[PDB]
A paper describes a structure:
[name] is an obligate bacterial predator of other Gram-negative bacteria, exploiting adaptations that allow consumption from inside the prey cell periplasm. The [name] protein appends the C-terminal GGDEF enzymatic domain with an N-terminal forkhead-associated ([name]) domain, known to be used (in other proteins) for interactions with phosphopeptide ligands. [name] comprised a ~30aa tail, 100aa [name], 20aa linker and 160aa GGDEF domain. We provide the molecular basis for initiation of c-di-GMP production, demonstrating that the stimulus is a phosphopeptide tail present on the [name] GGDEF synthase itself.
By combining a tailless [name] [name] construct (residues 32–131, V32 replaced with an initiating methionine) and synthetic phosphopeptide (N7SDNLEKpTSIVASDT17) in-trans, we were able to obtain complex crystals diffracting to 1.48 Å resolution. The asymmetric unit of this new form contained two [name] domains that were in an offset dimer identical to both the full-length and [name]-only structures, providing a third independent observation of this interaction. The exposed [name] cleft of chain B displays clear density for a bound phosphopeptide, allowing unequivocal modeling of residues 11–21. The conformation of the bound tail region does not differ substantially from that of the unphosphorylated complex (rmsd 1.0 Å for all atoms), but sits relatively deeper into the [name] cleft, making more extensive contacts. The more deeply situated tail is now able to form mainchain hydrogen bonds with R61, K72 and N97 (via both groups of the amide sidechain). The [name] surface creates two depressions which accommodate the two “inwardly projected” residues of the tail (pT14 and +3 V17); the flanking L11 and T21 sidechains sandwich opposing sides of the central [name] body. The central pT14 of the peptide tail is recognized by a multitude of interactions, the sidechain methyl group projecting into a pocket formed by residues 72–75 and 96–97, which positions the phosphate toward the positively charged R61 and R76. The phosphoryl group is tightly co-ordinated by the [name] cleft of [name]: OG by R61, O1 by S95 and T96, O2 by both the backbone NH and sidechain of R76, and O3 by R76 (and the backbone NH of pT14 also). Comparison of the peptide-bound and unbound [name] domain structures reveals that peptide binding does not induce any obvious gross conformational change or long-range signaling motions, merely alterations in the rotameric states of R61, K72 and R76. Our structure of the [name]:phosphopeptide complex demonstrates that cleft occupancy does not alter the [name]:[name] contacts, at least for a peptide added in trans.
Residue numbers in the entry: 32 to 134
């Protein structure tokens, strides 16, 4: 399977949902235009996005109100983080787990 993110912590409609990360330009946000749409008021309308190049998947912060945090480190606006298996990504009151192979 391609890589994915899983909702570890979130609202009841969303906890445990998995989203495949197959290509660049996938956006996490509360705007309905987002590919990873979560209805949580603490998530920015456009919060973060992914870049994919072969086996490398990175997350990019888009100037979010409540920040993008990977394993306890803040990713400042327009900066990025190369992900690895089991990393946690906190976006407001939502926390995702990154899986190098999705279930």
């Amino acid at each position: 399977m391609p890589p994915a993110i899983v909702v570890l912590i979130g609202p009841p409609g969303y906890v445990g949902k998995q989203y495949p990360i197959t290509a660049s330009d996938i956006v996490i946000g509360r705007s309905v235009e987002s590919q990873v749409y979560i209805d949580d008021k603490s998530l920015s309308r456009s919060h973060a996005k992914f870049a994919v190049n072969g086996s490398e998947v990175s997350v990019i912060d888009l100037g979010s109100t409540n920040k993008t945090i990977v394993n306890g480190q803040v990713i400042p606006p327009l900066a990025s983080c190369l992900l690895k298996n089991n990393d946690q990504i906190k976006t407001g009151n939502v926390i995702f787990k990154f899986l190098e192979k999705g279930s």
